[PDB]
């Protein structure tokens, strides 16, 4: 269950 939200 990793953090999936995009980054820069």
């Amino acid at each position: 269950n990793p953090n999936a939200n995009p980054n820069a």
Partner: antibody
Amino acid sequence: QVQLVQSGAEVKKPGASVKVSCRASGYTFTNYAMHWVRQAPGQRLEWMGWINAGNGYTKYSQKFQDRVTITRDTSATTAYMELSSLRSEDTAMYYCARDSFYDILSPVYHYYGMDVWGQGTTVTVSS
Amino acid sequence: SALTQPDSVSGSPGQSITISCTGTSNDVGIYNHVSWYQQHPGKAPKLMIYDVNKRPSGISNRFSGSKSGDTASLTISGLQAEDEADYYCCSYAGSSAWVFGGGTKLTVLG
């Protein structure tokens, strides 16, 4: 109530661009992410990309990376999707859907799921 | 490329059915970020199952999800006529990307 309202139907020529909007209301806008998904007539759902409503960071699908731009306007609590160089097979219904967002300070149990969907916007590409 | 679902599944009222969703070792097999969506013709999809086996508020306990290896499965108990719809699975694919399944059409006989 919690809802996402999208803009109306679009009719475009091959090679044009289209920009669909998705206005949020009823919840804290910058606490979530927002997907854009499309569905050709009689076909399956296809993920295009998503954006963090807060910091605006995006990730697009490898099939659309060259043609799609997803943006957001926090002051209007609205997300936008622009698809360029339209072609015949881009004719589909386009949906916006809300999902979870976790920041840096979030150790939390990360779960996801497109829990709220817009009504959909039809885009018709024809000469 | 997408996740492989059966094209159609059929059942009669009261019967239970199961819809498969086969992925790879890069999506369904690794992450618990697996969701199921119900879509009636012409309407927006509706989240039925998230995090493999969890239901949102109000969703009937007739809908259940599970995962074994690379294949996620959605079970619908006590089949009713209102369950006739297209059902889609979706999985995290790494690198902040998501992938949808091909879709399954559920028909209720009788």
